[PDB]
């Protein structure tokens, strides 16, 4: 990342590269751990879009940096249609924010960006990385989730709330879906057990604390 | 590495730390993953590599069947450079035993610290590509005809193994796009054949054709 | 074609077209030696856009006049996206090319068309005819060409260099597949005797050259 | 060809093509009608190299020229070792037979080649066409070409000695072998009818032509 007189910029140690990798490879790209450590390193430093394909190469498997740079590509050409249409309208075109092109192919040209091009590859390369795959799977839709027999219940919950976030892009029409879709494709058992209990928040709860406190022996 | 304080040069020897990061890297991921690429060449490119050093870096590294394709594709580089070393004008004095480090010019160290950088960037790069070809510890190459999307396989896992095949087998990066970007549509499963069909050649704009085409048939996995 | 001695449209003769079909009609439309006829009337006249229609028609299959019109039409779409992006811009639109509309519609108005007009629409109806089809075939697939048991090594390369060139326009990438696919999808016989010459081109030949002599006396 | 009333290349006729390529798919390229006619051609005209690309493409099957351009290419390697070997050495390289390279690669070069190149030439490209297969078959063994039953004696005798041409090249060795093989390979008929003739020409007469009246009605 480059550094506040001039723009010096300098590359990432070993020891980042290597606890990247060896959290990537072990828990997987988007486990809780992985996504607070690399919000911990966007959220404190400087990032070109440099940097970003630096950090992904050294950090994934092959099949999983094609999902990456084509997720960015896609989330750099929805944000180019809202930039234009401003008004202003901010000098914010496609080949400042994949960094490449003319006048964006190399790092000196680069370490002179502004703040809102920093903020607005930021959220792009996020939602690239919330986007990519385990290494054996596909992302499935919300017919084929279903507890199963001899399955707990917040082991079922988990999958919801991981099918709801690759898919859907907003929070507040995730919430709805996970929160009915948490009943209709329960167990006959959880279903028996969780009736009495729909649609009841006490006080300063989360619908989905009650469900899992409902239903807690069930399973097994 | 060796180093030079000018009038004279001198030889030290590998760390205790570094040979152990490069033994865990290469056992548990791979000899040619992208993290050790990149990890041999932040070594390379920032020391200043004899080929005794690239021998004790590889000896120490590899598996033992490994190492004998190192020091094959080594001895086959080599036999290629020396013939564009008599063919040029003037002919460069670069033989044959003094890239691969033997003979009796250059058979120790002392011998070997008082390299030109001609030759230093020359077995650089002939080490390097033969790195790129040493197998996974089971397998051997095989042929495009091979290299199929099979049925429920997600296709980003197959254009990784055409790419793979293709740094292998040739030597080309110009020739590897085209050849790569040929066959990601006649070896695709049906259902991957009828979603890429509409989108074939036609670029939007600024992008790789790989990039539009796993887009395209994303959600292949009912 | 059009002679300037100042315009005179004169019509094809009754035997340059006699000798057209009865050559499309046994050889096929794409032969070599077809090939060299269909040039020394192009490259030795001047035809415009009227001459291509009754050449054309007066020599090919019912089926392969569809063929030649579909590949005309789509040559010249990709043919302004060269001319109106090019400086300066040159005043080449479609209806030029194709000889329709108000003003390219009768034999007066074309017959003064410029030499940049000419040598354009005769490099994009040669291009048509490189894809008209054998009489009851459809183009097949690179994957699908294999040397069968018990043929010829010299058939097999004959038919590699046919579907390479109704599939790739460069002539480049040509290159590189026809030599590349020659050792692949060949039969196991030869592939044991292709193998030794692999990728050493001694002096002044071709890859294939050297690979049809290995298979020299490969038929049993 | 050139003519030289100092050169002049002149292209080839319309009808001269036309008739070597309806003679070329109706009887075969090895012919004896077109044997005597590319005779005709060759040794009544001044062939260059650049005239024999446009002859062999203009009148051959696409798998055809690719055995004409891999013959005529090892024909030269061969050449070359009996120039340089000879007392005094002869200027004649490879690419001034091939008709490639730098010197070597326009009609203006080409035209001024002296009759010990152009005698050359005329000599390898002719045995390049000796060797062009039928349009769907291999070259088989000596050992594989038997005499069927019911098949008549000299339908088997004109097989033998076109397997005899296109492996050896010396012509004395083809007359000791076609000799002896016809009576080896033949049937069991014919064996019993020739060998009271064996090997006792009268006079003024071939061994074959004496062999041939003796299975004068040896069908059935």
Not at 206 to 215: F, L, P, Q, R
Request: glycine residues 6%.
């Amino acid at each position: 990342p480059v550094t506040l007189v001039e723009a010096r910029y300098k590359s990432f140690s070993i020891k980042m590269l290597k606890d990247m990798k060896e959290g990537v490879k072990q828990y997987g790209p988007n486990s809780p751990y992985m996504r607070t450590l690399l919000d911990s390193i966007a959220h404190g430093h400087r990032l070109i879009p440099y940097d970003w394909e630096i950090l992904a190469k050294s950090s994934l498997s092959p099949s999983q940096f094609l999902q990456f740079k084509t997720w960015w590509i896609d989330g750099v050409q929805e944000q180019v249609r809202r930039n234009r249409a401003a008004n202003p309208p901010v000098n914010i075109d496609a080949d400042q924010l994949l960094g490449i092109g003319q006048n964006w192919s190399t790092i000196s040209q680069q370490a002179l960006m502004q703040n809102e091009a920093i903020e607005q590859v930021r959220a792009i390369c996020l939602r690239a990385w919330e986007k990519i795959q385990d290494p054996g799977s596909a992302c499935p839709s919300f017919n084929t989730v279903r507890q199963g027999s001899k399955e707990p219940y917040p082991d079922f919950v988990a999958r919801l709330q991981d099918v709801a976030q690759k898919s859907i892009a907003d929070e507040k029409a995730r919430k709805v879906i996970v929160e009915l879709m948490a009943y209709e494709n329960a167990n006959p058992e959880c279903q028996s057990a969780i009736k009495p209990l729909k649609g009841k928040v006490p006080a300063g709860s989360d619908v989905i604390s009650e469900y899992v406190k409902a239903c807690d022996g069930i399973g097994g």
